[PDB]
Write an enzyme that holds these catalytic residues in place. Structure first.
Site, mmCIF file in Angstrom:
data_model
loop_
_atom_site.group_PDB
_atom_site.id
_atom_site.type_symbol
_atom_site.label_atom_id
_atom_site.label_comp_id
_atom_site.label_asym_id
_atom_site.label_seq_id
_atom_site.Cartn_x
_atom_site.Cartn_y
_atom_site.Cartn_z
ATOM 1 C CB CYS A 138 -0.959 0.009 1.183
ATOM 2 S SG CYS A 138 -1.948 1.596 1.263
ATOM 3 C CB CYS A 141 -0.398 2.586 3.878
ATOM 4 S SG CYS A 141 -2.027 2.013 3.322
ATOM 5 C CG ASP A 142 3.572 1.495 4.607
ATOM 6 O OD1 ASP A 142 3.386 2.096 5.687
ATOM 7 O OD2 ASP A 142 3.157 0.339 4.361
#
Ligand code: FAD
Ligand code: FAD
Ligand code: NAP
Ligand code: NAP
Ligand code: CAC
Ligand code: CAC
Ligand code: K
Ligand code: K
Lengths: 319, 313
Positions: A138, A141-142
């Site tokens: 993701c 997300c990261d």
């Protein structure tokens, strides 16, 4: 914690993506008082993308989270009962149908399954070892952890290309790895990609598979690639590797109780109505969980509407 | 004018197809037909387009769809196809003045209002018989009007007219309606406390009027065959829609006027009986018939056509 003081409802909807929330809007307007279980990813797969440009009728500037906030507001406006839970076991051999979540158990007379799909992993032992320490599925997300760093993306579809584009504004360079020499992403996105390949900070590694994720006791420090044509290998130094090789339908809990093919729930389909009916009378399926071909938000929303009208007709035929 | 991809129809199936086709770098050309924006331009309230806040209107959504298609540089042509030739490749289509050809075609020409077929109904069209309440309702300000039909369209039209007309006489051949339950609740509130009158178990037997236009209707009781007369200035016919497929007769497999498509779970679901011709929206769906399902199959038709066009080389 309760003792199977089951919450019963006429209609239960599993999933809070565009299929589940469209089903809820239609079912609530049909006076079915729908209950919707959100699952663990509230709002579904769109909540991890930053721009949606093919939701028809929206001006420039829509995001994934933005659309799914609107969809939740819409279901709430018609008094959908939305429950934060996740179903871990079901019994469809009995009527009413029984579904066990982490918080409670649920029963229903009609069920709409719209549990969508989750990111697939390559299944490597080194990939599993470095999850959370540089391996991720993701990018929104990261991604921010990799500012000015080198990162890899594995895959060749819309998700991989979008993730490589997203990371190219954060990372110093993005290494996009794909096992063939052409991409199946939307052409507009391929044009953006190739502009950054020839003028920007994306590097292609076509005809390659990820052989091993390499790292130290802290986390990822590289990947070994294998040439699909010759079997030779090379090493790429990167601090993170994003896996973007597709999404797998969330159907593990239905195994053995619904007709399925390659993990997808089979439905009647066809032109004569009742097209979302599964192999169990009174259970309908909508969205990515039953579509291995189109897999868009607008097509998921459309079959969500059909599942609600199918269920309404089915419940009506009971009384 | 040749193009790789031609789209017939400017409703939600056509415009979603254009958005997806444009992003697939197919340079879609879209023919609007006569009803620019499609059926939804005739409704004032859309409440089940998922994710929109309260207050969406039909024309508002269809304006937004057109801007969306324009943003990706769809070529939009105000024309209407009156004749096609599918036995040739590229296919050839004839509009009102100019001709078009294409390698792939997406048909999303929708559906248009059915009439009962009565002689008097035909005689009074444009003079107090109408099939579109938002087009004509203002003309019956503080008048008595009739609406014939029992589905979502008739109930919405009776509700819309109830704010304009003095009385709305809603005529239906059974004693229950097939409209959305939330609309039936609104209808029954205006029946008990407002200006809508139900004539259930009735059919329209004849439209009555003078040399200028409608002055009444004769209703027939479906159980006994007895009749009664209603004084009204206008009659709105809302008995459903029929797919706009006349120009395709004999060149595509059809059933009851609906274009047949492959359907199924294996892809190419919008493919008609002619390779390279795809259909989406109300022209091929006699069961669901919503804006959101039409948009979904317009998306599928664009992705089917892109795979087809790619396969040519
Ligand atoms: C990075 C990314 C970008 C994308 N970009 C676009 C785009 O620009 N345009 C576009 O049209 N499409 C896009 N898509 C695809 C789109 O996200 C999907 O087609 C759509 O979200 C599918 O909707 P759905 O409701 O079937 O499933 P999902 O959106 O996957 O939602 C499924 C729901 O089911 C719930 N669930 C799962 N298991 C359980 C369980 N056991 N119990 C209860 N609930 C459960 C989940 O929590 C989730 O809420 C993108 C997808 C990804 C991953
Ligand atoms: C009064 C009313 C209220 C409604 N309310 C709602 C609602 O609240 N929510 C909802 O989901 N749905 C609603 N609907 C239904 C919705 O309008 C349809 O499901 C949807 O419009 C179908 O979209 P479409 O693109 O298939 O067809 P249409 O919207 O009918 O568009 C067909 C298009 O094809 C064009 N065309 C026709 N013939 C030709 C030709 N020979 N050449 C070129 N072009 C041609 C027409 O000009 C038109 O642009 C309503 C319908 C009506 C009548
Ligand atoms: N902008 C958008 O509309 C948008 C954005 C995101 C997702 N989506 C939609 O959502 C769906 C999912 O998209 P996706 O990109 O996640 O999946 P996808 O379309 O299935 O793409 C999977 C990609 O990964 C490759 N792949 C799969 N398994 C692999 C393995 N084990 N090892 C190496 N490579 C592997 C595939 O390669 P091959 O090509 O060789 O099979 C393919 O390129 C698609 O229908 C997509 O179009 C849309
Ligand atoms: N709010 C919305 O979502 C909305 C709004 C408008 C339309 N739509 C959708 O678009 C589609 C078209 O709807 P619609 O209402 O136009 O058509 P419909 O759903 O086909 O309903 C037709 C109605 O007219 C009656 N009828 C049909 N032929 C008749 C005849 N010859 N004489 C007398 N009565 C006749 C039918 O009666 P019987 O019931 O006796 O068959 C039925 O009540 C529907 O699927 C609808 O749900 C949706
Ligand atoms: C093939 As079946 C029983 O899911 O309609
Ligand atoms: C239903 As057919 C003959 O177009 O495959
Ligand atoms: K996206
Ligand atoms: K409407």
């Amino acid at each position: 914690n309760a003792m199977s003081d089951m919450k019963h409802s006429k209609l239960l909807i599993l999933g809070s993506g565009p299929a589940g929330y469209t089903a809820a809007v239609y079912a609530a307007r049909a006076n079915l008082n729908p209950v919707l279980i959100t699952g663990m990813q509230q709002g579904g797969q769109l909540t991890t993308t930053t721009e949606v440009e093919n939701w028809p009728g929206d001006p420039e500037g829509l995001t994934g989270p933005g659309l799914m906030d609107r969809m939740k507001e819409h279901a709430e406006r018609f008094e959908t009962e939305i429950i934060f839970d996740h179903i871990n076991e079901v019994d469809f051999s009995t009527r009413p149908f029984v579904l066990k979540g982490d918080a409670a158990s649920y029963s229903c007379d009609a069920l709409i399954i719209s549990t969508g799909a989750s990111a697939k992993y390559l299944g490597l032992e080194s990939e599993e070892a470095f999850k959370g320490r540089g391996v991720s599925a993701c990018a929104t997300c990261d991604g921010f952890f990799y500012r000015n760093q080198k990162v890899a993306v594995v895959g060749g579809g819309n998700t991989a290309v979008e993730e490589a584009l997203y990371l190219s504004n954060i990372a110093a360079e993005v290494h996009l790895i794909h096992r063939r020499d052409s991409f199946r992403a939307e052409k507009i996105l391929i044009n953006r990609l190739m502009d950054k390949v020839q003028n920007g900070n994306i590097v292609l590694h076509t005809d390659r598979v990820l052989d091993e994720v390499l790292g130290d006791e802290m986390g990822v420090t590289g990947v070994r690639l294998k040439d699909v044509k010759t079997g030779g290998t090379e090493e790429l130094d990167v601090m993170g590797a994003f896996i973007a090789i597709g999404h797998s339908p969330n159907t593990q809990i239905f195994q053995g109780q619904l007709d399925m093919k390659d993990g997808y729930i089979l439905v009647k389909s066809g032109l004569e109505g009742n097209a979302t009916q599964t192999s169990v009378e009174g259970i309908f399926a909508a969205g990515d969980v039953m579509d291995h071909n189109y897999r868009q938000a607008i097509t998921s929303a459309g079959t969500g509407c059909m599942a609600a009208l199918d269920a309404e007709r089915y419940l009506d035929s009971l009384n």
